[PDB]
């Protein structure tokens, strides 16, 4: 009973510091804090609803933060494909409309294809474009990305102008908007102690 409470305090504090690190573009720190949170997941945390929301947001951010490492897997799927799955889960569990998550779904799918193209993984880019963009977005963009792949044209403006920093900061901005504002109890007590 006591350990659960502290465990949640600890998870929530490190969630707060992970966001702070992600928001400051300190991804090395983000990953170190992520690994601490990962190790916490095997300990009792109380009712699953008390932590489900922050954990979904942290899952999505963790997959986005690894989005450029195609030598990395969260599902036996490239990291940005995994993030798409988590985004769907967030839509359902957070009781969001399709319209509210549409522009974010669009950013992640476009990022998933563009990263494959940037690493010259044209076959992976093609399979991702067919799996996630066939049944959602516009035919001209599909056609543009297809032709970029067929021609291996990394010089195309869609590729050249893509910024992964901007992409993941936009993703953090959307994900954060669905979180409560309470400052973590541990951080409060640390301010009072110092």
């Amino acid at each position: 009973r006591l350990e659960e409470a502290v465990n949640r305090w600890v998870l929530k504090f490190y969630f707060h510091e992970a966001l702070r690190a992600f928001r400051g573009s300190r991804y090395g720190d983000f990953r170190q804090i992520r690994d601490i949170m990962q190790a916490l997941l095997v300990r009792p945390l109380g009712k699953e609803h008390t932590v489900s929301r922050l954990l979904r947001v942290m899952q999505c951010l963790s997959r986005i933060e690894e989005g450029e490492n195609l030598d990395c897997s969260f599902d036996m799927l490239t990291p940005l494909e995994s993030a798409i799955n988590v985004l769907e889960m967030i839509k359902t569990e957070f009781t969001l409309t399709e319209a509210v998550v549409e522009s974010s779904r669009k950013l992640v799918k476009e990022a998933a294809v563009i990263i494959c193209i940037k690493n010259k993984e044209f076959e992976k880019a093609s399979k991702i474009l067919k799996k996630h963009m066939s049944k959602d977005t516009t035919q001209k963009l599909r056609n543009d990305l297809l032709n970029i792949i067929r021609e291996k044209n990394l010089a195309h403006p869609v590729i050249q102008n893509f910024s992964y920093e901007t992409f993941q900061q936009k993703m953090l901005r959307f994900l954060e908007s669905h979180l409560d504002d309470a400052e973590p109890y541990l951080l409060t007590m640390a301010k009072k102690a110092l």
Binding site: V42, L55, R56, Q59, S62, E66, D71, C72, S73, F74
Partner: peptide, 16 residues
């Protein structure tokens, strides 16, 4: 069923 809490909410990548 057999899914664990750590599995459902896995944060770190399985293969890196």
């Amino acid at each position: 069923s057999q899914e664990t809490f750590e599995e459902k909410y896995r944060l770190s990548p399985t293969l890196s």
